[PDB]
Design a binder for this molecule. Structure first.
Ligand SMILES: Nc1ncnc2c1ncn2[C@@H]1O[C@H](COP(=O)(O)OP(=O)(O)O)[C@@H](O)[C@H]1O
Ligand SMILES: N#Cc1cc(C(=O)Nc2cc(F)c(=O)n(CC(F)F)c2)sc1C(F)(F)F
Length: 576
């Protein structure tokens, strides 16, 4: 192999010198051999099963007829030993159909797994919520977090006491020495809306190191017309055709490695490769549009949206954590206030205004939303919802927070009504009538979670918890808010300490969604998504022009030297 490479190298170097026309005749012969081969390998009855019901293990909702065919389709794939792409439009039950598959195979094929599901990090909590709702019997692992955390889980893996494991791209790559070893019965991956640049590296590693018989690719976009992408799709769906862990550019150039001379396809040659790969992949792709199944669309569409913390949120959080019975119950109240807004702490707001350039000591404008992950995220939801004439219902369990909520709506000029436990039955009735009468210009209905029929509201933003209706629960990243979503006086104290088991993290991937994932959860149609994408770039235009540009979240570099390493000061400003 060195001996041959040394010689075959000198062979190519000697033709370049002594018969340049013969050297050209060879390379053009080699180029065509790669094409002819590519075409030749791709130039190529089935087992029936009818699926009348869903799994008995699938509960708390019954499948739509179209989703039933999705299940029946992916089962047909299974029996006939095939891979697939479920590419249904956004909001049609791709996550619910994947759970219907696993639960059906566990029941009727006694296939207990293990099932590997790879998802974008921002939607992990979304996946884990919808498994808890629809298939709680299923035993699942969440392989992510600090090494300490990941190692904690190795016993349960070697053991094999689990049906499903969810993880993200970095852990599939970082921890191959743990995860590749497992003998996965299934390898389901979530691309999100569209293929991203980092998915080429993922395709290669997967069929370099991992051993999964069955594969599914979940996606929101239809079959693309670019060679490099479609190569990764061929080698994920049908790896046995070319048994290669390469990019198309490397695979095609393989024979010219010793030439030291790259080879590039022309217009005619490209279109043909693309037109073929299209024809090879087409039969393996099921895509139903919202309009095709209009009379079966889900009535309630739920999603979980994620928040970073401001630099301020972090420092306050770390303080109230490492300072910590109904004392615990109290420590969980303070951590919820921070995730909600740091300026709930009056003395923190006043001192920061002095430093942000407000003599008066009352924060206003953008600086309201900039100090809270959740408020900053809400600022990217509500404008969009309003621009599509959607009428929101926003739950806020804390009556303290509502002062800051009202001041935020004031800033963005959102017309609203408020309803608390400080509202009499006479006042209540009238407020509801005002929101519900046809034409009401009242956009938001701010509520304190204490019976009330707001049929006028077609959107529900849960802000802090314990005729299609879109529900959006906000949730802070690596916070208590994650732990509350996951749902004997010695054991009821050990439960409140399981709520408090925090660990500081430094993952690679963003735990907050990009603009495409987010507008997919807010939007009910292709027009809403399209608009929201423009509204997002309109915000990037506004910021670009603005002379005094600040990031959307307050970062450490713009903090005062009196909050940075001063457990006294934080305590001096937070206490009551
Ligand atoms: N057959 C159904 N019955 C009840 N709710 C459903 C059904 N199908 C989907 N939903 C709801 O609609 C939403 C669909 O989420 P999902 O389809 O998994 O995400 P996406 O379609 O964006 O991949 C969820 O809130 C789910 O509970
Ligand atoms: N994540 C990840 C990931 C995404 C992959 C991919 O093939 N995306 C492509 C490539 C297309 F060409 C295309 O048309 N589409 C749309 C089609 F589904 F109709 C998708 S492969 C992969 C893996 F293996 F890394 F997990």
């Amino acid at each position: 192999s060195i001996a041959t490479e040394r010689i075959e190298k000198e062979r190519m170097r000697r033709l370049m010198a002594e018969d340049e026309e013969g050297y050209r005749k060879l390379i053009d012969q080699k180029k065509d051999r790669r094409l002819a081969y590519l075409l030749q390998q791709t130039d190529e009855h089935a087992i029936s099963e009818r699926v009348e019901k869903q799994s008995a293990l699938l509960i708390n909702g019954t499948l739509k007829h179209y989703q039933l065919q999705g299940l029946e389709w992916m089962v047909s794939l299974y029996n006939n030993n095939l891979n697939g792409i479920l590419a249904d439009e956004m909001g049609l039950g791709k996550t619910i159909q994947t759970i219907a598959l696993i639960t059906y195979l566990m029941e009727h094929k006694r296939l207990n797994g293990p099932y590997l599901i790879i998802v974008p990090l921002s939607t992990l909590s979304n996946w884990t919520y919808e498994f808890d709702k629809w298939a709680p019997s299923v035993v699942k692992i969440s392989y992510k977090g600090t090494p300490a955390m990941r190692r904690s889980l190795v016993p349960q893996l070697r053991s094999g006491k689990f049906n499903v494991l969810l993880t993200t791209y970095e852990y599939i790559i970082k921890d191959k020495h743990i995860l590749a070893k497992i003998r996965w019965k299934y390898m389901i991956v979530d691309e999100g809306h569209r293929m991203k640049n980092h998915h080429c590296k993922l395709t290669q590693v997967l069929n370099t190191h991992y051993v999964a018989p069955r594969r599914i690719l979940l996606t929101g976009t239809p079959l693309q017309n670019k060679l490099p992408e479609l190569w990764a799709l061929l080698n994920f769906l049908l790896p046995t055709i070319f048994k290669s862990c390469s990019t198309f550019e490397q695979w095609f150039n393989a024979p010219f490695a010793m030439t030291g001379e790259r080879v590039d396809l022309n217009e005619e040659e490209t279109i043909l490769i693309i037109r073929r790969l299209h024809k090879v992949l087409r039969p393996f792709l099921l895509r139903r549009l919202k309009k095709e199944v209009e009379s079966q669309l889900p009535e309630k569409v739920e999603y979980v949206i994620k928040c970073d913390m401001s630099a301020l949120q972090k420092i306050l959080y770390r303080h109230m954590q490492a300072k910590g019975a109904k004392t615990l119950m109290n420590t969980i109240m303070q951590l919820r206030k921070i995730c909600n807004h740091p300026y709930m702490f009056q003395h923190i707001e006043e001192s920061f205004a002095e430093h942000l350039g407000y003599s008066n000591g009352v924060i206003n404008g953008a600086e309201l939303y900039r100090a809270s992950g959740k408020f900053e995220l809400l600022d990217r939801i509500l404008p969009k919802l309003r621009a599509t004439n959607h009428r929101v219902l926003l739950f806020c369990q804390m009556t303290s927070l509502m002062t800051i909520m009202e001041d935020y709506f004031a800033f963005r000029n959102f017309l609203y009504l408020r309803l608390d436990g400080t509202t009499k039955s006479e006042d209540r009735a009238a407020l509801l009538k005002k929101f519900n009468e046809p034409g009401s210009q009242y956009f938001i209905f701010l509520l304190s979670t204490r019976g009330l029929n707001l049929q006028a509201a077609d959107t529900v933003v849960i802000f802090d918890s314990d005729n299609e209706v879109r529900v959006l629960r906000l949730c802070t990243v690596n916070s208590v808010e994650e732990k509350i979503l996951a749902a004997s006086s010695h054991e009821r104290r050990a439960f409140l300490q399981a709520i408090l088991e925090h660990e500081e993290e430094n993952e690679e991937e963003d735990e907050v969604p990009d603009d495409e994932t987010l507008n997919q959860m807010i939007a009910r149609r292709e027009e809403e998504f399209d608009l929201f994408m423009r509204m997002d770039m309109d915000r990037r235009r506004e910021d670009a022009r603005n002379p005094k540009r600040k990031p959307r979240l307050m970062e450490e570099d713009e903090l005062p030297s009196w909050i940075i390493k001063d457990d006294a000061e934080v305590e001096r400003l937070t206490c009551e």
